[PDB]
DNA sequence: ACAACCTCCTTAGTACATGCAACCATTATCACCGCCAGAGGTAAAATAGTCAACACGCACGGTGTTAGATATTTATCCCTTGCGGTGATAGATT
């Protein structure tokens, strides 16, 4: 996720899960961690917004 | 007084425009050598220091194990092909 340059979770909140399969060494387990570590904050994945 | 005129006198004022390629030498010529400057040298001590000793202490990298990812294999699914049936187009008219 450092190689994939996602240095603000403000965009990890809205990048598609298929669009994280865009740099190698990022496979079936790391792609699966995302699915609740964002929720653990009191947040979610999948939250596009009209101003950022 | 002078005036310019006849002749060949010499003087010397000019010689259109746009562009690209190349490289930068020849001279000889005693600078003497004497003096001494601050001024080169270096010994011994200021402005301060080396790196070897014995300690100190840490980082980094490679060997080992683990992790998980990925590219393969498999198999599923959809979007696409090509033909066909027959579509309301293109556009002439109302």
CB distance A27 to A37 below 8 Å: no
d(CA A28, CA A20): 11
Q: In the complex, which nucleotide's C1' lies nearest to the CA atom of residue A33?
A: B68
Residue A39: enclosing H or E segment and its boundaries?
helix A30-40
d(CA A5, CA A35): 19
Q: Which of A22, A21, A20 is nearest to A9 (CA)?
A: A20
d(CA A14, CA A10): 8
Dihedral angle of Cα A2, A36, A44, A9, to the nearest 10 degrees: -10
Nucleotides of B under 7 A from a protein CB: 68-71
Q: In the complex, which nucleotide's C1' lies nearest to the CA atom of residue A25?
A: B69
Separation in Å, CA A21 to CA A36, A40, A49: 18, 22, 22
Q: What is the resolution of this structure in A?
A: 17.0
| Structural biology method used | cryo-EM
Separation in Å, CA A44 to CA A15, A23, A32: 12, 22, 14
């Amino acid at each position: 996720l450092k190689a994939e340059a996602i240095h603000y979770i403000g965009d990890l909140v809205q990048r598609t899960e298929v669009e994280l399969l865009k740099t190698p060494n990022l496979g079936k387990k790391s792609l699966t961690e995302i699915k609740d570590v964002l929720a653990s904050r009191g947040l979610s994945l999948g939250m596009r917004l009209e101003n950022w």
